[PDB]
Amino acid sequence: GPSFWLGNETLKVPLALFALNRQRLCERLRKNPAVQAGSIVVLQGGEETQRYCTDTGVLFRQESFFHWAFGVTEPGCYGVIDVDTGKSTLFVPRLPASHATWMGKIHSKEHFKEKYAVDDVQYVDEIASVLTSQKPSVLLTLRGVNTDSGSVCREASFDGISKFEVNNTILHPEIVECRVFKTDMELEVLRYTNKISSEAHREVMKAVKVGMKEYELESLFEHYCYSRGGMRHSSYTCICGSGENSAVLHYGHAGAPNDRTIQNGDMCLFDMGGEYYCFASDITCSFPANGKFTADQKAVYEAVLRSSRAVMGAMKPGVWWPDMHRLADRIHLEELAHMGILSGSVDAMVQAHLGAVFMPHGLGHFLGIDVHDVGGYPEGVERIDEPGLRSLRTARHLQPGMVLTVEPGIYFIDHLLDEALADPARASFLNREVLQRFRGFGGVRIEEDVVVTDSGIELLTCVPRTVEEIEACMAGCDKAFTP
Amino acid sequence: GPSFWLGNETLKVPLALFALNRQRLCERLRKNPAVQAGSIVVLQGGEETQRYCTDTGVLFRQESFFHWAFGVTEPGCYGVIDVDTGKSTLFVPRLPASHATWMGKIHSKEHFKEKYAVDDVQYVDEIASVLTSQKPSVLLTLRGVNTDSGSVCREASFDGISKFEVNNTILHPEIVECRVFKTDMELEVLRYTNKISSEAHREVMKAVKVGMKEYELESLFEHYCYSRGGMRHSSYTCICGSGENSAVLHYGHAGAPNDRTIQNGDMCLFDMGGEYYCFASDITCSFPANGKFTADQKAVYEAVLRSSRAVMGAMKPGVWWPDMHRLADRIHLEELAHMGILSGSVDAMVQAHLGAVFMPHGLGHFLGIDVHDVGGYPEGVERIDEPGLRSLRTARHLQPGMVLTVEPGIYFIDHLLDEALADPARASFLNREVLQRFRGFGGVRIEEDVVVTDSGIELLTCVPRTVEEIEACMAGCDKAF
Ligand SMILES: [Mn+2]
Ligand SMILES: [Mn+2]
Ligand SMILES: [Mn+2]
Ligand SMILES: [Mn+2]
Ligand SMILES: [O-]
Ligand SMILES: [O-]
């Protein structure tokens, strides 16, 4: 069958991937006792947009549920799936013949049918007539709450939909649950996004020089990903934090736009991940700007390496994700004490939630078509109201097919350190004579993407991770070199 | 005073640029007989957005009118200007101290006052209180129709605005008219965007190899512009059309995403322009993929080079832009006749609008903070309902300080050719046996950015243009042009 492909060394993605997703969704809905015979799933794709009131077009990137089901790259479409038969119909815009003046060949409906390997293609303005003739019982539309943004998913609507019975509650938890569990075909794409983003991270580590602006490395990363990987988009805005900016967790946005000059002795924390055909990657590499870890940098870095590897070694089906977050906290506290930054009982430190001073964010999150992927908090799974844990994007138990980031870090964040020093319950654990040395250190984060297997994990990411590996990479060693 | 800068070799842009724009706006409003004493201009900045229902952030780019007036890069702001005094107040979000963890330093109001060189800074949650204390007659807000998109400008709103008298008709035509005329400080930025984008086009011409994907050159272009120019955004989505795609005017978008392999013998038409601090550039270069023009390619290319230069040379204050569009049409028809694609009287061809078969788009447009900049069709300036001319984005007469693209092209577009061949009034001019050779040729566009001066134009773009320059550039020969 047909494949999406951007040529050269880029990945061929079979359109069968999306057919399988549609099949799996139907299979799930068929098992759902509340789904009526003759129901049809109705999804509305994204539409073209412009900047504010201008005619400056914004590059169109498909809505994630619609992409998951159909893989369609064009704006202005709808898509329906008959639950009982699995039959798929794509609705595409009707462009007047005169648009050929501007657009070139206007593609036929047969073109799209062949391209996307759907059962039928119709024009969008005919959706009411086509659905009327199929005599559906119920239209199942998409409405629900994203638990990371708090936004409500956009439910499909078309002129005449009021003539139909519409249910907008059943679909969302079901299609979310399908997205949580990745197919073999989806895993091939996520291996690829990790391959290209890993290569790009290595190129960035090889190219970094003291004196460069952070954004020069953002640019280089995105150029590698697009020119060598066919990744027109990033999965999220690149975070290129140097020096103290490596302690700024959302760094790189318009208000702090990767515009610092990298200095000798800085740590760099670069969190970047290309997107291929709407599939994410999310990788963070931490390393010394000048290519040589100081003793203090080695100690902080290796503490995060220890927690990274301990969590990866413990992950398997049945593990409760919050227990992994707490494992990373404990290890960080142990290692910060072995460094002289902290003193006292680590058991007592954990009871005081001291780990959250150094890692205020969650250990990791589902990843898929969105970088913060759907389904972390389905009904009945509760957020934990404790420092650090409250920032976790899922409190689920791990199961085969889930894809997660594993991203412990340690940061030296003044207002959190100062709060701790002001708090009699935490202040005694902090040794200021050593801690003072780490004010302005920034932070270290080591972020891997992994798949939960039947018995453990598969690591998707492939970047240098030991101090020796990183120093070798920055010294321009071939990848096929083993410190 | 302070300046915007991304370090290295990037341009320092004085915040005084925006202060001058505010002054100029007030001066126009003060002359407007409908403007009441004690009016306050109220603009609302852009807000942070995410992809659909996700928490995936979209990189924030400021709304163009707000940028023009204030130069502010942060989301969630408002800005007001007292018309009678010119006093400026920026309203910034009040962030809880707890935010220092994620988005970085919680800058004070004083930090922003110094950064933007405004007269006062307040928090957004205080805007109604602050404006109430100023006892305005009326709030002047932004509402109007963009004549390229057809969209209505988003008028400012805030909690409590209903307690004020608001006028949403006066401002838009006045701030649009200010934007049409670029200040010397604005021109320095547009010289820079054209410098960097010109350099990036040159690197692309040096790098193109048969067998590459179109998007490889888009990537290189944007990488040059960001890493060397500090241009995080492009002014519009890059058009990297090769072969028959160079005849596709709307190419490079999501539905046709620069995904063709460049083949030996193809023409390339690359329309790309970096954006710096929300100021545009818009440049198109056309050239053979393999670095050597064939005779047919040379003939089509030099025809557009001739119209490009004829239009630039004729532009001066008082020239009617539609006349420049028809000048290019006439030159194209002359050259296509010399080539043998056409036969007969060029006067009769013009009368039959045959030029629009080969150039269906407008000759060029205003450029500024938006690539298709505002103010092409103010009240009293009408669109001309003829082929080609109806696509013009302005029918104004030129005046010093206007910035325009000059972008004639010749394309071989099957829909338009077939229509012409069915029409006895146009078919007689077309030599089918010669035209057949050019089916699938693609197209050529040469796009320069220029400023109207007191006596002529200033050319901002600096890329290789003659056949000799282009071939030398692509062969990897040393030096400029
Ligand atoms: Mn990340
Ligand atoms: Mn992450
Ligand atoms: Mn252009
Ligand atoms: Mn243009
Ligand atoms: O992350
Ligand atoms: O253009």
GROMACS .gro file of N, CA and C in nm, chain B residues 168-280:
model
  339
  651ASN      N    1  -1.470   5.269   1.745
  651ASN     CA    2  -1.389   5.167   1.678
  651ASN      C    3  -1.383   5.188   1.528
  652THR      N    4  -1.412   5.310   1.484
  652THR     CA    5  -1.404   5.340   1.341
  652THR      C    6  -1.290   5.435   1.302
  653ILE      N    7  -1.256   5.531   1.388
  653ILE     CA    8  -1.159   5.635   1.354
  653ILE      C    9  -1.016   5.581   1.337
  654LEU      N   10  -0.974   5.493   1.428
  654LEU     CA   11  -0.832   5.460   1.439
  654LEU      C   12  -0.776   5.386   1.317
  655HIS      N   13  -0.846   5.282   1.274
  655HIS     CA   14  -0.791   5.189   1.177
  655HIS      C   15  -0.738   5.258   1.051
  656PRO      N   16  -0.818   5.344   0.985
  656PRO     CA   17  -0.759   5.404   0.864
  656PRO      C   18  -0.637   5.493   0.891
  657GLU      N   19  -0.631   5.554   1.009
  657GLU     CA   20  -0.521   5.643   1.044
  657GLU      C   21  -0.392   5.566   1.076
  658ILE      N   22  -0.401   5.459   1.154
  658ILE     CA   23  -0.281   5.384   1.188
  658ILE      C   24  -0.234   5.307   1.064
  659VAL      N   25  -0.327   5.262   0.981
  659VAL     CA   26  -0.290   5.200   0.854
  659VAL      C   27  -0.210   5.298   0.767
  660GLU      N   28  -0.258   5.421   0.755
  660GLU     CA   29  -0.190   5.518   0.671
  660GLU      C   30  -0.049   5.550   0.724
  661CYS      N   31  -0.033   5.556   0.856
  661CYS     CA   32   0.102   5.574   0.910
  661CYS      C   33   0.194   5.457   0.870
  662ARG      N   34   0.141   5.335   0.872
  662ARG     CA   35   0.221   5.218   0.839
  662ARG      C   36   0.266   5.216   0.692
  663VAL      N   37   0.188   5.278   0.606
  663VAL     CA   38   0.220   5.281   0.463
  663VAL      C   39   0.352   5.354   0.436
  664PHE      N   40   0.384   5.453   0.518
  664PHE     CA   41   0.501   5.538   0.499
  664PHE      C   42   0.608   5.504   0.601
  665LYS      N   43   0.721   5.449   0.555
  665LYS     CA   44   0.822   5.398   0.646
  665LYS      C   45   0.918   5.508   0.692
  666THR      N   46   0.950   5.509   0.821
  666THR     CA   47   1.042   5.608   0.873
  666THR      C   48   1.183   5.564   0.838
  667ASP      N   49   1.279   5.654   0.852
  667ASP     CA   50   1.418   5.617   0.827
  667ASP      C   51   1.461   5.502   0.916
  668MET      N   52   1.415   5.500   1.041
  668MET     CA   53   1.453   5.392   1.132
  668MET      C   54   1.394   5.259   1.085
  669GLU      N   55   1.269   5.261   1.038
  669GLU     CA   56   1.210   5.140   0.983
  669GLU      C   57   1.284   5.091   0.857
  670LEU      N   58   1.326   5.186   0.772
  670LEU     CA   59   1.399   5.150   0.650
  670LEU      C   60   1.532   5.085   0.683
  671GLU      N   61   1.596   5.125   0.793
  671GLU     CA   62   1.720   5.060   0.829
  671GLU      C   63   1.694   4.912   0.861
  672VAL      N   64   1.579   4.881   0.921
  672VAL     CA   65   1.550   4.742   0.951
  672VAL      C   66   1.519   4.662   0.823
  673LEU      N   67   1.446   4.723   0.730
  673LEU     CA   68   1.413   4.656   0.605
  673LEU      C   69   1.536   4.640   0.513
  674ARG      N   70   1.634   4.728   0.525
  674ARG     CA   71   1.762   4.708   0.457
  674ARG      C   72   1.832   4.585   0.512
  675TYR      N   73   1.826   4.568   0.644
  675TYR     CA   74   1.886   4.452   0.710
  675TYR      C   75   1.815   4.321   0.676
  676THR      N   76   1.681   4.317   0.677
  676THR     CA   77   1.611   4.194   0.646
  676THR      C   78   1.641   4.154   0.504
  677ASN      N   79   1.651   4.252   0.415
  677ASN     CA   80   1.689   4.224   0.277
  677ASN      C   81   1.834   4.182   0.263
  678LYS      N   82   1.924   4.239   0.343
  678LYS     CA   83   2.064   4.195   0.341
  678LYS      C   84   2.077   4.048   0.380
  679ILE      N   85   2.022   4.011   0.495
  679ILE     CA   86   2.035   3.872   0.539
  679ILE      C   87   1.965   3.775   0.443
  680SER      N   88   1.842   3.807   0.402
  680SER     CA   89   1.771   3.719   0.313
  680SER      C   90   1.841   3.706   0.177
  681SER      N   91   1.905   3.815   0.130
  681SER     CA   92   1.982   3.810   0.005
  681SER      C   93   2.102   3.716   0.018
  682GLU      N   94   2.172   3.726   0.130
  682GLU     CA   95   2.285   3.637   0.157
  682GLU      C   96   2.237   3.492   0.161
  683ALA      N   97   2.122   3.468   0.224
  683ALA     CA   98   2.070   3.333   0.237
  683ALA      C   99   2.029   3.279   0.099
  684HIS      N  100   1.970   3.363   0.015
  684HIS     CA  101   1.938   3.320  -0.121
  684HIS      C  102   2.063   3.282  -0.199
  685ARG      N  103   2.172   3.357  -0.179
  685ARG     CA  104   2.298   3.327  -0.245
  685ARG      C  105   2.355   3.193  -0.199
  686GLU      N  106   2.349   3.165  -0.068
  686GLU     CA  107   2.392   3.036  -0.017
  686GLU      C  108   2.308   2.923  -0.072
  687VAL      N  109   2.179   2.945  -0.085
  687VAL     CA  110   2.092   2.844  -0.146
  687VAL      C  111   2.129   2.818  -0.292
  688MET      N  112   2.152   2.923  -0.370
  688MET     CA  113   2.191   2.902  -0.509
  688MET      C  114   2.323   2.826  -0.519
  689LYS      N  115   2.416   2.851  -0.427
  689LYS     CA  116   2.542   2.777  -0.428
  689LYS      C  117   2.526   2.630  -0.388
  690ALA      N  118   2.426   2.602  -0.307
  690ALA     CA  119   2.408   2.469  -0.250
  690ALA      C  120   2.319   2.376  -0.333
  691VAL      N  121   2.233   2.430  -0.419
  691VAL     CA  122   2.139   2.346  -0.493
  691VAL      C  123   2.211   2.245  -0.581
  692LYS      N  124   2.170   2.120  -0.568
  692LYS     CA  125   2.220   2.011  -0.652
  692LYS      C  126   2.102   1.931  -0.700
  693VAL      N  127   2.107   1.890  -0.827
  693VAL     CA  128   2.011   1.795  -0.878
  693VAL      C  129   2.005   1.674  -0.784
  694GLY      N  130   1.883   1.628  -0.756
  694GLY     CA  131   1.861   1.515  -0.668
  694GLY      C  132   1.820   1.555  -0.526
  695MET      N  133   1.841   1.681  -0.489
  695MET     CA  134   1.794   1.729  -0.359
  695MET      C  135   1.644   1.746  -0.357
  696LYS      N  136   1.586   1.736  -0.238
  696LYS     CA  137   1.448   1.775  -0.216
  696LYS      C  138   1.437   1.926  -0.200
  697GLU      N  139   1.329   1.983  -0.254
  697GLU     CA  140   1.304   2.126  -0.239
  697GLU      C  141   1.319   2.173  -0.094
  698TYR      N  142   1.267   2.096   0.001
  698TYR     CA  143   1.270   2.140   0.141
  698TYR      C  144   1.410   2.147   0.201
  699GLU      N  145   1.508   2.083   0.138
  699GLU     CA  146   1.644   2.093   0.187
  699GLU      C  147   1.690   2.238   0.174
  700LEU      N  148   1.644   2.306   0.070
  700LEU     CA  149   1.684   2.444   0.051
  700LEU      C  150   1.604   2.537   0.141
  701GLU      N  151   1.476   2.508   0.164
  701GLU     CA  152   1.400   2.582   0.265
  701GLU      C  153   1.472   2.580   0.401
  702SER      N  154   1.515   2.461   0.441
  702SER     CA  155   1.584   2.442   0.568
  702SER      C  156   1.711   2.526   0.578
  703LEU      N  157   1.794   2.521   0.472
  703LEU     CA  158   1.918   2.595   0.465
  703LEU      C  159   1.892   2.744   0.474
  704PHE      N  160   1.793   2.790   0.398
  704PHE     CA  161   1.758   2.931   0.401
  704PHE      C  162   1.725   2.980   0.542
  705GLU      N  163   1.634   2.909   0.607
  705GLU     CA  164   1.588   2.947   0.739
  705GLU      C  165   1.698   2.933   0.841
  706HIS      N  166   1.787   2.836   0.823
  706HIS     CA  167   1.902   2.820   0.913
  706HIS      C  168   1.999   2.937   0.899
  707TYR      N  169   2.026   2.978   0.776
  707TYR     CA  170   2.113   3.095   0.758
  707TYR      C  171   2.048   3.215   0.826
  708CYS      N  172   1.921   3.239   0.796
  708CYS     CA  173   1.853   3.357   0.849
  708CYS      C  174   1.850   3.358   1.001
  709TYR      N  175   1.829   3.243   1.064
  709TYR     CA  176   1.826   3.241   1.211
  709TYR      C  177   1.966   3.247   1.270
  710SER      N  178   2.051   3.153   1.233
  710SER     CA  179   2.184   3.147   1.297
  710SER      C  180   2.269   3.273   1.265
  711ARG      N  181   2.260   3.330   1.145
  711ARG     CA  182   2.344   3.445   1.110
  711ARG      C  183   2.270   3.579   1.122
  712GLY      N  184   2.138   3.576   1.111
  712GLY     CA  185   2.059   3.697   1.108
  712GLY      C  186   1.972   3.720   1.229
  713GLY      N  187   1.962   3.621   1.317
  713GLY     CA  188   1.877   3.634   1.433
  713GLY      C  189   1.729   3.633   1.400
  714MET      N  190   1.695   3.579   1.283
  714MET     CA  191   1.557   3.570   1.236
  714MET      C  192   1.494   3.437   1.275
  715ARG      N  193   1.419   3.438   1.385
  715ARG     CA  194   1.357   3.318   1.435
  715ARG      C  195   1.240   3.277   1.347
  716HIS      N  196   1.173   3.376   1.287
  716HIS     CA  197   1.060   3.353   1.196
  716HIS      C  198   1.095   3.385   1.052
  717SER      N  199   1.026   3.321   0.959
  717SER     CA  200   1.020   3.371   0.821
  717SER      C  201   0.900   3.464   0.807
  718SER      N  202   0.903   3.550   0.706
  718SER     CA  203   0.794   3.644   0.681
  718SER      C  204   0.667   3.577   0.628
  719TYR      N  205   0.686   3.459   0.569
  719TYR     CA  206   0.579   3.378   0.511
  719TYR      C  207   0.640   3.240   0.487
  720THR      N  208   0.557   3.140   0.461
  720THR     CA  209   0.608   3.005   0.436
  720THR      C  210   0.690   3.003   0.307
  721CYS      N  211   0.810   2.947   0.312
  721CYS     CA  212   0.897   2.939   0.197
  721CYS      C  213   0.835   2.863   0.082
  722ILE      N  214   0.848   2.921  -0.036
  722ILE     CA  215   0.806   2.858  -0.160
  722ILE      C  216   0.931   2.809  -0.232
  723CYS      N  217   0.950   2.677  -0.238
  723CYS     CA  218   1.066   2.622  -0.308
  723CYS      C  219   1.018   2.535  -0.423
  724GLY      N  220   0.975   2.600  -0.531
  724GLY     CA  221   0.913   2.529  -0.642
  724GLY      C  222   1.013   2.489  -0.749
  725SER      N  223   1.021   2.360  -0.781
  725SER     CA  224   1.108   2.312  -0.889
  725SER      C  225   1.028   2.248  -1.000
  726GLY      N  226   1.081   2.253  -1.122
  726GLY     CA  227   1.012   2.195  -1.236
  726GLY      C  228   0.876   2.257  -1.253
  727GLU      N  229   0.775   2.173  -1.275
  727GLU     CA  230   0.641   2.223  -1.301
  727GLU      C  231   0.586   2.297  -1.180
  728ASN      N  232   0.644   2.273  -1.063
  728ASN     CA  233   0.597   2.344  -0.944
  728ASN      C  234   0.633   2.491  -0.944
  729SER      N  235   0.729   2.533  -1.027
  729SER     CA  236   0.757   2.674  -1.034
  729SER      C  237   0.643   2.750  -1.102
  730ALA      N  238   0.550   2.680  -1.169
  730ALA     CA  239   0.429   2.745  -1.223
  730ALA      C  240   0.313   2.746  -1.122
  731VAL      N  241   0.332   2.681  -1.008
  731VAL     CA  242   0.230   2.679  -0.904
  731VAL      C  243   0.252   2.794  -0.808
  732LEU      N  244   0.164   2.894  -0.817
  732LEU     CA  245   0.190   3.018  -0.749
  732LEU      C  246   0.177   3.001  -0.600
  733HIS      N  247   0.076   2.923  -0.559
  733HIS     CA  248   0.057   2.890  -0.419
  733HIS      C  249   0.116   2.751  -0.395
  734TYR      N  250   0.248   2.749  -0.373
  734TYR     CA  251   0.327   2.627  -0.352
  734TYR      C  252   0.402   2.636  -0.218
  735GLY      N  253   0.429   2.522  -0.155
  735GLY     CA  254   0.507   2.519  -0.031
  735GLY      C  255   0.425   2.503   0.096
  736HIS      N  256   0.296   2.532   0.086
  736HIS     CA  257   0.202   2.512   0.197
  736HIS      C  258   0.185   2.365   0.228
  737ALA      N  259   0.105   2.338   0.332
  737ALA     CA  260   0.089   2.202   0.382
  737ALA      C  261   0.039   2.103   0.277
  738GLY      N  262  -0.042   2.152   0.182
  738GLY     CA  263  -0.096   2.066   0.077
  738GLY      C  264   0.001   2.038  -0.037
  739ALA      N  265   0.113   2.111  -0.041
  739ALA     CA  266   0.213   2.095  -0.147
  739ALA      C  267   0.349   2.131  -0.088
  740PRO      N  268   0.397   2.048   0.004
  740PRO     CA  269   0.494   2.094   0.102
  740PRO      C  270   0.642   2.082   0.060
  741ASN      N  271   0.678   2.144  -0.052
  741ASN     CA  272   0.818   2.147  -0.093
  741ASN      C  273   0.880   2.008  -0.091
  742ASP      N  274   0.807   1.907  -0.138
  742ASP     CA  275   0.852   1.769  -0.126
  742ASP      C  276   0.890   1.704  -0.258
  743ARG      N  277   0.916   1.783  -0.361
  743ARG     CA  278   0.960   1.727  -0.490
  743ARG      C  279   1.112   1.719  -0.502
  744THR      N  280   1.159   1.615  -0.572
  744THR     CA  281   1.301   1.602  -0.604
  744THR      C  282   1.336   1.691  -0.721
  745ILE      N  283   1.439   1.773  -0.704
  745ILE     CA  284   1.486   1.863  -0.808
  745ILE      C  285   1.555   1.777  -0.917
  746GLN      N  286   1.512   1.793  -1.042
  746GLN     CA  287   1.565   1.710  -1.150
  746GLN      C  288   1.649   1.793  -1.244
  747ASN      N  289   1.743   1.726  -1.311
  747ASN     CA  290   1.822   1.791  -1.414
  747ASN      C  291   1.730   1.852  -1.518
  748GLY      N  292   1.760   1.976  -1.556
  748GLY     CA  293   1.684   2.049  -1.655
  748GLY      C  294   1.570   2.132  -1.599
  749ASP      N  295   1.539   2.114  -1.471
  749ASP     CA  296   1.433   2.193  -1.409
  749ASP      C  297   1.472   2.337  -1.390
  750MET      N  298   1.371   2.425  -1.391
  750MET     CA  299   1.386   2.557  -1.333
  750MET      C  300   1.347   2.555  -1.185
  751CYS      N  301   1.413   2.639  -1.107
  751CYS     CA  302   1.378   2.658  -0.966
  751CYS      C  303   1.324   2.797  -0.948
  752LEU      N  304   1.219   2.811  -0.867
  752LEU     CA  305   1.165   2.940  -0.830
  752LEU      C  306   1.153   2.939  -0.679
  753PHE      N  307   1.241   3.012  -0.612
  753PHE     CA  308   1.250   3.011  -0.467
  753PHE      C  309   1.215   3.147  -0.412
  754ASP      N  310   1.103   3.151  -0.340
  754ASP     CA  311   1.046   3.273  -0.285
  754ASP      C  312   1.054   3.259  -0.134
  755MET      N  313   1.149   3.329  -0.072
  755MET     CA  314   1.178   3.312   0.070
  755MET      C  315   1.224   3.447   0.126
  756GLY      N  316   1.188   3.474   0.251
  756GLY     CA  317   1.225   3.600   0.312
  756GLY      C  318   1.221   3.591   0.462
  757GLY      N  319   1.335   3.609   0.529
  757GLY     CA  320   1.336   3.607   0.674
  757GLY      C  321   1.269   3.729   0.734
  758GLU      N  322   1.224   3.715   0.859
  758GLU     CA  323   1.164   3.825   0.935
  758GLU      C  324   1.254   3.856   1.055
  759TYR      N  325   1.286   3.986   1.077
  759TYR     CA  326   1.362   4.027   1.194
  759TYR      C  327   1.281   4.123   1.278
  760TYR      N  328   1.257   4.088   1.404
  760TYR     CA  329   1.182   4.174   1.497
  760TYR      C  330   1.051   4.221   1.432
  761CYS      N  331   0.981   4.125   1.372
  761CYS     CA  332   0.852   4.146   1.301
  761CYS      C  333   0.859   4.235   1.179
  762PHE      N  334   0.978   4.259   1.124
  762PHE     CA  335   0.988   4.328   0.996
  762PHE      C  336   1.018   4.228   0.884
  763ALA      N  337   0.945   4.242   0.772
  763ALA     CA  338   0.951   4.145   0.664
  763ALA      C  339   1.065   4.164   0.568
   0.00000   0.00000   0.00000
